[PDB]
Amino acid sequence: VLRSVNSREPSQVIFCNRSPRVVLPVWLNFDGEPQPYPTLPPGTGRRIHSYRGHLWLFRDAGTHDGLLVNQTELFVPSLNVDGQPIFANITLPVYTLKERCLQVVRSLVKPENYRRLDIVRSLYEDLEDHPNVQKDLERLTQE
Amino acid sequence: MMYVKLISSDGHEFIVKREHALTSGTIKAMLSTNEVNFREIPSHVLSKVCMYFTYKVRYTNSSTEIPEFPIAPEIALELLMAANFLDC
Amino acid sequence: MDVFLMIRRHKTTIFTDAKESSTVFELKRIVEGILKRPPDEQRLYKDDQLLDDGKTLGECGFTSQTARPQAPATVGLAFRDTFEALCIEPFSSPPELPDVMK
Numbered sequence: 236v237l238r239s240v241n242s243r244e245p246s247q248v249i250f251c252n253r254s255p256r257v258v259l260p261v262w263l264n265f266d267g268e269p270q271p272y273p274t275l276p277p278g279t280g281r282r283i284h285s286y287r288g289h290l291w292l293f294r295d296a297g298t299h300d301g302l303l304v305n306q307t308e309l310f311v312p313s314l315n316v317d318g319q320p321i322f323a324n325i326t327l328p329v330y331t332l333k334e335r336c337l338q339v340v341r342s343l344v345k346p347e348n349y350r351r352l353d354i355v356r357s358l359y360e361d362l363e364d365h366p367n368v369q370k371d372l373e374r375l376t377q378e
Numbered sequence: 379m380m381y382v383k384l385i386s387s388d389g390h391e392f393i394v395k396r397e398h399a400l401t402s403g404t405i406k407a408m409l410s411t412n413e414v415n416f417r418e419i420p421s422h423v424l425s426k427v428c429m430y431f432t433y434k435v436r437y438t439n440s441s442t443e444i445p446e447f448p449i450a451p452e453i454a455l456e457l458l459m460a461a462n463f464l465d466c
Numbered sequence: 467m468d469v470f471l472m473i474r475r476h477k478t479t480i481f482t483d484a485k486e487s488s489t490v491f492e493l494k495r496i497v498e499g500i501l502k503r504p505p506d507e508q509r510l511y512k513d514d515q516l517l518d519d520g521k522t523l524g525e526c527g528f529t530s531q532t533a534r535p536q537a538p539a540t541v542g543l544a545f546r547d548t549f550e551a552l553c554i555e556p557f558s559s560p561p562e563l564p565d566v567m568k
């Protein structure tokens with residue numbers, strides 16, 4: 236269900252990274268398969284050529300933590316008005332404290348050593364449940 | 379506004395807005411005196427939890443660009459355990 | 467522009483926000499509603515420097531850069547015929563990093 240539409244109608248977009256992360260843009264192709272695009276460093280913007288009805292999501296390039304674009308999960312280019320580009324402002328979500336702690340711990344501990352940490356077993360499983368695009372697409376489809 | 383007192387294991391008293399504290403479903407249940415004691419959370423963790431409450435209320439549903447919530451490596455594991463318990 | 471503070475005395479820490487343009491005096495009014503002590507019984511400090519009631523918080527050095535929600539700025543408080551000495555007890559010390567986190 237979540238797939239780009241082959242509109243063939245050009246739409247110019249500014250991918251504007253307003254996050255502290257290196258951002259990976261992800262394009263959902265016409266079969267709903269996610270395709271990675273070039274990364275954007277923190278504090279950078281790029282004018283890119285996309286199409287109306289196309290679907291994009293944004294993630295941390297190294298960790299795949301999910302990011303927000305114009306305050307939501309999915310970005311769909313629309314029609315350009317006045318020759319103005321559509322802005323896609325990529326930002327951090329407000330992560331839960333638990334998820335942010337999981338991010339930092341994963342950043343420090345190799346997955347093979349998660350089970351060495353002195354914490355309850357359910358948190359081993361939470362640490363091992365790394366963020367990933369495919370699961371979020373399934374969550375979004377069901378919504 | 380209404381304030382609650384959250385007390386760490388080492389006896390530090392943290393006075394925060396109730397609306398901020400209710401970010402944690404655990405704390406809401408513990409409140410429902412106006413004081414909550416955490417026998418397992420020391421102040422170098424609970425102070426950071428209160429900063430998170432402030433951070434969440436300020437930036438949730440905000441269009442300003444959102445800064446990262448910072449967490450030093452030396453507190454990360456205990457803060458994870460507190461966050462798991464507090465459900466926030 | 468809002469500023470975000472920890473108002474600290476002894477082993478008490480108050481988390482609150484205020485305007486950069488609001489005054490030290492208006493902040494003591496905040497403290498009064500919470501701690502039930504009058505402004506004339508309060509002394510507020512930035513680091514070791516006592517702060518004048520007329521001065522704005524920004525003037526004292528509390529700004530968006532220094533007083534953020536994630537990293538709040540600390541305002542020292544001393545209560546009183548003699549005002550006590552400013553004393554803020556530090557937070558506890560984190561343990562040593564687990565080896566798998568090194």
Ligand SMILES: Cc1ncsc1-c1ccc(CNC(=O)[C@@H]2C[C@@H](O)CN2C(=O)[C@@H](NC(=O)C2(F)CC2)C(C)(C)SC[C@H]2CC[C@@H](CN3CCOCC3)CC2)cc1
Nearest residue numbers: 243244250260262271272273274275281283284285286289
């Ligand atoms: C610099 C930068 N920084 C962060 S992103 C970014 C960037 C960089 C290049 C662009 C060019 N723009 C698109 O590729 C827009 C985007 C999306 O809308 C799909 N797409 C199309 O062009 C689709 N084509 C069609 O739909 C039609 F032709 C109308 C029928 C396709 C994908 C079916 S064919 C396009 C061809 C040529 C371009 C490569 C793009 N390679 C691959 C990824 O690595 C480098 C770039 C892919 C195959 C855009 C953004």
